[PDB]
Amino acid sequence: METIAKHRHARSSAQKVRLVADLIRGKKVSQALDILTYTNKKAAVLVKKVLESAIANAEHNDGADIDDLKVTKIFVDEGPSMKRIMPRAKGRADRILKRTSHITVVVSDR
């Protein structure tokens, strides 16, 4: 059972969301839920929404009994970057990379 769930084009950066993902990597659904709820990060809620989507998918589109479910594979990946021009001193122009990341959560009973 895969029961995959992802949130593409997320505003949060992959480098900053991998830190939150590692905390819940390989932990039980309830433990991950509470850790994300009480984590002091925007990425915490960003990935808690994905975890809720995944568990709802498991409940409805797949087998019930979410109690014996574990987050087996979770990984954060970068997404398309938007180019923005920010004026600087001496007339110099630099480019600001509005980075977006793809987050995928896979939950399986075994």
Binding site: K90, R92, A93
Partner: peptide, 17 residues
């Protein structure tokens, strides 16, 4: 994606004479 049009003139070199 335009190349920087204006580049400031280099800082004057230190006197090495």
């Amino acid at each position: 994606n335009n190349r920087p049009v204006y580049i400031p003139r280099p800082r004057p070199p230190h006197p090495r004479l």
